[PDB]
Amino acid sequence: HLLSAKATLPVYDRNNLAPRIVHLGFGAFHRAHQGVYADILATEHFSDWGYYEVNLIGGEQQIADLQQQDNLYTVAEMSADAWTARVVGVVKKALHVQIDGLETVLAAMCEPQIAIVSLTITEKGYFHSPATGQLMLDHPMVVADVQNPHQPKTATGVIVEALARRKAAGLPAFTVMSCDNMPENGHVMRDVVTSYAQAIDVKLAQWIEDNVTFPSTMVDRIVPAVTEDTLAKIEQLTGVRDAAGVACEPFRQWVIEDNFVAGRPEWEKAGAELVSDVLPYEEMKLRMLNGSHSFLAYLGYLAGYQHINDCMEDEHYRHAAYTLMLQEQAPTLKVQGVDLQDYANRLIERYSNPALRHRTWQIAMDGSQKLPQRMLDSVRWHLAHDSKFDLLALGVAGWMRYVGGVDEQGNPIEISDPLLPVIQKAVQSSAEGTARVQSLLAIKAIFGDDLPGNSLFTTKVTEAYLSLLAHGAKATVAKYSVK
Numbered sequence: 465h466l467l468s469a470k471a472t473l474p475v476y477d478r479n480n481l482a483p484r485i486v487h488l489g490f491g492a493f494h495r496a497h498q499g500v501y502a503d504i505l506a507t508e509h510f511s512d513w514g515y516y517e518v519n520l521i522g523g524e525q526q527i528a529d530l531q532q533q534d535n536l537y538t539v540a541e542m543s544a545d546a547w548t549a550r551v552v553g554v555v556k557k558a559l560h561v562q563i564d565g566l567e568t569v570l571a572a573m574c575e576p577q578i579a580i581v582s583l584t585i586t587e588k589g590y591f592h593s594p595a596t597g598q599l600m601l602d603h604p605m606v607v608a609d610v611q612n613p614h615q616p617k618t619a620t621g622v623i624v625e626a627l628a629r630r631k632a633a634g635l636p637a638f639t640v641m642s643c644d645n646m647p648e649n650g651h652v653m654r655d656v657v658t659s660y661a662q663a664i665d666v667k668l669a670q671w672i673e674d675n676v677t678f679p680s681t682m683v684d685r686i687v688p689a690v691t692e693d694t695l696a697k698i699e700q701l702t703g704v705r706d707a708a709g710v711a712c713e714p715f716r717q718w719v720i721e722d723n724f725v726a727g728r729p730e731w732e733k734a735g736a737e738l739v740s741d742v743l744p745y746e747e748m749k750l751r752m753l754n755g756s757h758s759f760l761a762y763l764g765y766l767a768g769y770q771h772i773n774d775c776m777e778d779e780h781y782r783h784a785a786y787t788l789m790l791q792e793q794a795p796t797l798k799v800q801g802v803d804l805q806d807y808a809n810r811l812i813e814r815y816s817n818p819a820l821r822h823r824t825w826q827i828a829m830d831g832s833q834k835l836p837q838r839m840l841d842s843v844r845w846h847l848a849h850d851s852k853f854d855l856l857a858l859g860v861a862g863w864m865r866y867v868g869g870v871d872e873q874g875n876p877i878e879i880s881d882p883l884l885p886v887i888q889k890a891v892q893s894s895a896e897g898t899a900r901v902q903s904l905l906a907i908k909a910i911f912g913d914d915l916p917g918n919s920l921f922t923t924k925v926t927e928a929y930l931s932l933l934a935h936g937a938k939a940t941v942a943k944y945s946v947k
């Protein structure tokens with residue numbers, strides 16, 4: 465049914481694509497981002513790089529959806545000015561450990577032509593401490609894989625077992641490319657893989673060290689979670705109902721460290737920035753975009769703004785986000801050759817996209833995994849430089865107020881976070897007010913050891929938090945926006 469859609473369709477020969485990349489975490493973002501880059505290459509630049517799409521944990525529905533429409537899916541770009549749709553054809557096979565089985569997945573990863581394994585498994589999928597970037601060796605998912613390394617359940621476990629098998633077969637290693645929203649995401653990937661391999665087999669660890677590269681990336685495209693309204697809107701645009709369809713903004717960026725062991729698609733031809741060092745761009749985007757996103761998510765949700773576009777209708781939230789981007793995030797950056805005021809202006813325009821409904825609740829998810837790179841590293845810069853960080857402090861206070869679990873009208877907030885048990889215990893064991901700040905600050909996996917030991921940070925977050933309690937989020941953002 466998809467080939468009758470009002471959309472651009474795969475005009476290249478799909479059978480001529482080889483499955484050369486295995487992607488872990490077939491979610492909305494991968495579909496609308498990397499999948500689109502690959503499809504442009506297959507369409508315009510004679511690329512034969514196709515994908516095996518694999519889900520290991522959750523995401524059973526996406527995989528099943530593909531399996532009955534010849535692995536095709538729809539991406540619809542939407543903004544105020546235009547919409548466009550594309551039916552993507554680069555997926556050669558879509559697998560799920562719960563459907564096809566783990567052995568089939570490992571076998572696919574051990575085919576000789578697999579050159580890259582890429583990941584969008586969310587920050588929590590790495591089972592690392594957000595504050596340190598290091599593998600949690602005592603995490604039950606990690607210990608279970610370490611005890612049963614040939615039947616792994618984690619992404620790292622699966623990757624390392626695939627590598628063990630390739631090594632034993634005398635097959636070349638693949639490159640492992642994280643596309644998740646962490647600074648130096650290739651270092652995180654390298655570290656967790658290395659720590660894990662060393663825990664099970666030191667010869668395998670050394671071979672991995674000698675044969676695998678872990679290039680870092682920066683990825684950017686706003687892709688809200690797909691709802692029934694999303695699917696209905698894509699149907700209305702294309703004429704065809706696609707359960708695996710995704711809606712996104714027209715903007716896309718992908719910065720890639722050019723360090724691959726077994727080749728790569730010519731992504732630069734589809735608009736990727738292939739460079740030697742991605743870190744300054746990661747920090748730029750994680751801080752100015754994701755940091756402002758998070759600020760808006762907690763303080764917007766608490767004010768009763770359901771979506772980011774709703775936040776942008778409040779001139780104070782608009783001004784606060786802009787001031788946060790340019791006066792607090794931008795000065796912490798080392799990036800060269802970018803007009804950051806213009807970038808900030810463009811982010812506000814992107815947030816104001818009236819064609820998307822990006823829920824503050826969705827962005828608020830997994831705050832424990834996001835705070836360090838999005839806000840806390842910037843705070844550290846300001847602390848070291850004796851510089852003010854008022855809006856960052858309010859952002860942190862906003863997360864703290866949110867995870868208290870009761871909204872300003874006295875209704876429950878459903879908190880989604882892998883550290884929920886720790887967060888709940890911190891909330892339940894502390895009185896509202898100044899005690900609550902102290903208690904949440906004490907979660908070292910989020911705040912590290914320096915920030916809880918920092919009197920200035922503690923004072924500023926506490927002041928912001930007491931303002932949220934006394935005046936609510938909406939009025940507090942208004943106050944801080946002129947401050």
Ligand SMILES: NC(=O)C1=CN([C@@H]2O[C@H](COP(=O)(O)OP(=O)(O)OC[C@H]3O[C@@H](n4cnc5c(N)ncnc54)[C@H](O)[C@@H]3O)[C@@H](O)[C@H]2O)C=CC1
Nearest residue numbers: 489490491492493521522523584585586589644645686687
């Ligand atoms: N606007 C966006 O949605 C953007 C997302 N990203 C990155 O992509 C990641 C995924 O985003 P979406 O696709 O929108 O989310 P999604 O919820 O649509 O997909 C999440 C994917 O991660 C997998 N996953 C979840 N927990 C896992 C675990 N413990 N182990 C292995 N796999 C796991 C799921 O199976 C699913 O395939 C984000 O966490 C972020 O790092 C990056 C830029 C923009």
Ligand SMILES: O=C(O)[C@@H](O)[C@@H](O)[C@H](O)[C@H](O)CO
Nearest residue numbers: 683684685686754757826827
């Ligand atoms: O936390 C989130 O859900 C958002 O801040 C990001 O997914 C944001 O949409 C992207 O990273 C922008 O590329």
